[PDB]
């Protein structure tokens, strides 16, 4: 923690909740479909670029 | 037009354009991501 | 040019905590000049009427020593704030 | 930048521009 | 069991089962303002007890 | 002001020397780091650890 | 808009006008605590070790937190405590208000 950086915004409280299916599909980055990983990244797969850089991979999103 | 902000895979839209920077560990991050597997959401509210 | 009162929530510094008016003023009011805001609505053509809030309600408003809450892990100070645009 | 030091937390509009 | 009647519900998941303590947090929509000891720190804010009990101000000299 | 009688005396010693400084935090957040570094450089660089700040943004920061 | 973030302030600053304690009424301990001291002592010495104008002579010490300690013991500390009540109520004592030990 810099002490020369301060924060001004804080977490006065969290409060449970249910991410509903409409949320998540509109949040979301990609759908995953195929149930390969790799051939480098599977493009559509688990370690597709829009879910975040990857081995030098820039992130898509 | 000026609040239009777009994405690297092209999609651009309009949004959120109010967001703050708060301090928290990182283990908060990965326990939100892991309860968002679940389904599960915890909104954060943020003071000022 | 609209005169477009608004809040602020600015930070105080150490080196301010002597001219707290003159602090807020160069740390945020004089970057804003001749720069559009996207809270606003145009360009920020100038500023007066810089008053600070306290952090002490109890105060009366025509005193001078007023109250900055420091941030309980560093030394900055944060308050709320009233002044006054001049917006193109 | 962008800094806690240099722009406000939040600018909040406290009444119409006037 | 003597646990459950509690505010916080960060801190019966810390404690444990959390699965079960989650689950009763997110059907009932609970609200913890950050009280326990334990929800500061799995949010990390300064603590309550000791010398986070009070606040510290400023007196500037100008208004 | 009224650290840099040890601070310098310090970031000379340089990282193995103790009492020494293994970095030398600007104010902009760089962190530069005095363990692959000569006497010299390392006196230079105490010798201009307390000036002031070129850039308007940074100007309420001090080194660390 | 603009008039609802004024109302939301009005509220606010009401809460906080209704949360405080004026300073003819407290009945908390006239004594700083330990955890008082300690704190005031640690956020003194981060404002001067941050470059803050600074009231008692330095003696060629360096040491914030002794810098610090000095001006406790001189009450040249601007500083305010703000105790909590358990109910969100607040007293404001001033350092030099109170009495060190
Ligand atoms: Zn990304």
Redesign the pocket.
Known sequence: MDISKPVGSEITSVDFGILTAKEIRNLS?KQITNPTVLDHPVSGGLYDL????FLRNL??? | DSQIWED?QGNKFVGGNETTTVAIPFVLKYLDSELSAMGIRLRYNVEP | IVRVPIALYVSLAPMYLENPLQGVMKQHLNPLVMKYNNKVGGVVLGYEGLKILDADPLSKEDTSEKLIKITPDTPFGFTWCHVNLYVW | TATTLNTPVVIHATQLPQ | QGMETSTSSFMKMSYETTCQFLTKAVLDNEREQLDSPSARIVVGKLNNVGTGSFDVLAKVPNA | AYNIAELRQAVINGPDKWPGATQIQNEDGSLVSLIGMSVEQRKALANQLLTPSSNVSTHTLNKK | GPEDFQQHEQIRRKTLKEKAIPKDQRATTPYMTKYERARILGTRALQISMNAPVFVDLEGETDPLRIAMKELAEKKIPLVIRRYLPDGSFEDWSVEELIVD
């Open positions: 980055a829009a879910l975040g850089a992130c898509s999103t | 690297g």
